[PDB]
Curated annotation (Swiss-Prot):
Record SUPFAM superfamilies: Ribosomal L11/L12e N-terminal domain, Ribosomal protein L11, C-terminal domain
Protein name in UniProt: Large ribosomal subunit protein uL11
Post-translational modification: Ubiquitinated at Lys-40 and Lys-75 by RNF14 and RNF25 in response to ribosome collisions (ribosome stalling).
Quaternary state and interactors: Component of the large ribosomal subunit. Mature ribosomes consist of a small (40S) and a large (60S) subunit. The 40S subunit contains about 33 different proteins and 1 molecule of RNA (18S). The 60S subunit contains about 49 different proteins and 3 molecules of RNA (28S, 5.8S and 5S).
Cross-link for Glycyl lysine isopeptide (Lys-Gly) (interchain with G-Cter in ubiquitin), residue positions: 40, 75
Modification Phosphoserine, positions: 30
Residues carrying N6-acetyllysine: 46
GO cellular component: cytosolic large ribosomal subunit
RNA sequence: CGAUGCCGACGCUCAUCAGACCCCAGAAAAGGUGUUGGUUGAUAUAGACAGCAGGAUGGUGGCCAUGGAAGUCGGAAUCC
């Protein structure tokens, strides 16, 4: 029996207080083993929370990582990760490559719930300032850059 | 209690605590869709104000965060 469930995991870091026993417990498979398998299957994220889908059968489950738009933005932003102490004001400072935004727009077009590419670049660059970074200037600069100088295929 | 017993003029006020003339014998801040005026800004045939009903969604379960907070506890943010 196919059962699709959503789990917002903390990434490669193993969380102490889990939220796996009420959802997976009555199905049968061990939630500690589920958390260990998700922490092994993430691997390269190591910092962020990802809404991973799990397709559970009668025998065992399968893990499918679904990256969000903000998840891809903070994945593209490469900072050194810190410890469990988590020092305050860890808000992101840097510069996002525009080709990375093009790649995220192509992946969101492959997921295919949007307008065509001109809309996807605008909405992902609008989520970029909600993440809190800028491509050599903020969103009103890229609004001016979109006018008569677009780079849409 | 002498004198409006003016064919007086115009408005305001209803008080289930009305009000009625310097000192002086009583009243405040805060309120009222009670009613009478004034100041300013709106929208209305590109169809307003009430009135009876339908949607109120995607990027996203946004990033710091907390045992947990997925728009509906805080603070930065607050765009397509």
């Amino acid at each position: 029996e196919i059962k699709v469930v959503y789990l917002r995991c903390t990434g490669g870091e193993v969380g102490a207080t889990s939220a796996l026993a009420p959802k997976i417990g009555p199905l049968g498979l061990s939630p500690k083993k589920v958390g260990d398998d998700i922490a092994k299957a993430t691997g390269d994220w190591k910092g962020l929370r990802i809404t991973v889908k799990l397709t559970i059968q009668n025998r065992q489950a399968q893990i499918e990582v679904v990256p969000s738009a903000s998840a891809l933005i903070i994945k593209a932003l490469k900072e050194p990760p810190r410890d469990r102490k988590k020092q305050k004001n860890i808000k992101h400072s840097g510069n996002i490559t525009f080709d990375e935004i093009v790649n995220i727009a192509r992946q969101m077009r492959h997921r295919s719930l949007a307008r065509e590419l001109s809309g996807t670049i605008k909405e992902i660059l609008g989520t970029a300032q909600s993440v809190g970074c800028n491509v050599d200037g903020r969103h009103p600069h890229d609004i001016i850059d979109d006018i008569n100088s677009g780079a849409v295929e």
